[PDB]
Design a protein around this ligand. Structure first.
Ligand SMILES: Nc1ncnc2c1ncn2[C@@H]1O[C@H](COP(=O)(O)OP(=O)(O)OP(O)(O)=S)[C@@H](O)[C@H]1O
Ligand SMILES: [Cl-]
Ligand SMILES: [Cl-]
Ligand SMILES: [Cl-]
Ligand SMILES: [Cl-]
Ligand SMILES: [Cl-]
Ligand SMILES: [K+]
Ligand SMILES: [Mg+2]
Length: 313
C-alpha cells in the first residue's frame, strides 16, 4: 500500500472482494474533501478572473462534482461500490477538459490582477490536486480489472526504457507529421532496470518533454530537416530515485527566455503548459524537473521521480 503525499494506493488483498469496499470507502470519503478544497480555490481567485465565463464553467463542474459525490450514500456492499465506480467514471469524463478550459479562461484574465505569482500558485495547486485525484480514482477502478504486472495503476515491474519508448514513437509521429521528419532517440544508462512504479505521471511528463525536445531540434535545423541531431535519454536508477535525462541538440533555451519557460502560458510557439505542468507534477510526487541550457547547442532536461516507498532497482 504505497502513498504520496496524504493519499494512498491500496495493495488489493482480493478474495471476498473485501478490498474493493475498503478502497471504495476510502475513495468515497476523500474525493469530496479534496473537491471542497478546490472549491475554496475558486472562491478566493481574483474577482475579475473568477468572473470569466469558462472559469465559472469549471467552477460549476467542481461544485457539481462535490454534490454528486456528497449525495452518494455510504458504501455498504458491492452493489454500492459498483455503482460508485459508475459515478467516479462519469466525473472523470466530465472533467477531462478541465485543464484546457482553465488554460483558456485564464489566459486573458490573469493579465489583470495585482499578484502575478498568484495565478501560478493556483494553477500549481489545482492541477496537482487533480492529478492526485485522478490517480486515486483510476487506481480504485483499476483494482477491478486484472492486467499483468499491475495492482491497480501500480505496475509491479515497470521498464523505464519501455515506457520511454512508448512516448518516443508517439512524439516522433506527432513531429514527423509536422516537419516531414523527427529526430531519432537513443536511450542509455540503466536500460534494463525494472521496478515497481506508477506510469501515470510518466505518461504525462515524458510526452511533454519529448515534444519540447523534438520541436526544438526541428525549428533549429530548418535547412536539413531530413537530417537532424539525435535526442539522447539517459536512465539512472538508484535506491532513492529514478532519474531520466533528456538531452537535445536543438539550440538551447535563450537567455532571454530562461525565466519564463516555467511560467504557465509562456511559449515561443501549444499553450505553454508542458514545463510548468510537468514540474508541478514532479514536485507534487516528491521529485523535480530541472533544465540545463547550453545556448547555441541544446538543452538538457532532468526528470527526477522518487521510488515507490522502497529503494527500487
Ligand atoms: N528542449 C527545449 N529546447 C528549447 N526550447 C525549449 C525546450 N523545451 C521548452 N522550450 C521553450 O520553453 C517554452 C515553454 O514550453 P512548454 O511549457 O513545454 O510549452 P509549449 O511547448 O510552448 O506548449 P505546450 O506544452 O504544448 S502547451 C517553449 O515554448 C520553448 O520556447
Ligand atoms: Cl486535495
Ligand atoms: Cl457560483
Ligand atoms: Cl448520503
Ligand atoms: Cl511536434
Ligand atoms: Cl550502464
Ligand atoms: K511555459
Ligand atoms: Mg511543451
Amino acid at each position: 500500500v504505497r502513498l504520496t503525499p496524504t493519499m494512498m494506493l491500496y495493495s488489493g488483498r482480493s478474495q471476498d472482494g473485501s478490498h474493493l469496499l475498503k478502497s471504495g470507502r476510502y475513495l468515497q470519503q476523500e474525493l469530496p474533501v479534496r473537491i471542497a478544497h478546490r472549491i475554496k480555490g475558486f472562491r478566493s481567485l481574483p474577482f475579475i478572473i473568477g468572473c470569466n465565463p469558462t472559469i465559472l464553467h469549471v467552477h460549476e463542474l467542481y461544485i457539481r462534482a462535490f454534490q454528486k459525490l456528497t449525495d452518494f450514500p455510504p458504501i455498504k456492499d458491492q452493489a454500492d461500490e459498483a455503482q460508485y465506480c459508475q459515478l467516479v467514471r462519469q466525473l472523470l469524463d466530465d472533467h477531462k477538459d478541465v485543464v484546457t478550459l482553465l488554460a483558456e479562461g485564464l489566459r486573458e484574465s490573469r493579465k489583470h490582477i495585482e499578484d502575478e505569482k498568484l495565478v501560478r500558485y493556483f494553477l500549481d495547486k489545482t492541477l496537482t490536486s487533480r492529478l492526485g485525484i485522478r490517480m486515486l480514482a483510476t487506481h480504485h477502478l483499476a483494482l477491478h480489472e486484472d492486467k499483468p504486472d499491475f495492482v491497480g495503476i501500480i505496475c509491479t515491474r515497470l521498464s523505464p526504457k519501455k515506457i520511454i519508448e512508448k512516448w518516443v514513437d508517439f512524439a516522433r509521429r506527432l513531429c514527423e507529421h509536422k516537419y516531414g521528419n523527427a529526430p531519432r532517440v537513443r536511450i542509455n544508462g540503466h536500460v534494463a532496470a525494472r521496478f515497481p512504479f506508477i506510469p501515470m505521471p510518466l505518461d504525462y511528463i515524458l510526452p511533454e518533454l519529448l515534444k519540447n525536445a523534438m520541436r526544438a531540434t526541428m525549428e533549429s535545423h530548418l535547412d536539413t530537416p531530413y537530417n537532424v541531431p539525435d535526442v539522447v535519454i539517459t536512465i539512472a536508477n538508484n535506491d532513492v530515485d529514478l532519474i531520466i535525462r533528456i538531452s537535445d541538440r536543438g539550440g538551447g533555451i535563450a537567455h532571454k527566455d530562461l525565466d519564463r519557460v516555467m511560467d504557465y502560458h509562456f511559449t515561443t510557439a501549444g499553450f505553454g503548459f508542458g514545463l510548468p505542468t510537468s514540474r508541478a507534477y514532479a514536485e507534487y510526487l516528491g521529485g523535480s524537473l530541472q533544465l540545463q541550457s547550453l545556448q547555441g547547442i541544446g538543452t538538457d532536461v532532468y526528470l527526477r521521480l522518487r521510488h515507490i516507498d522502497g529503494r527500487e532497482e
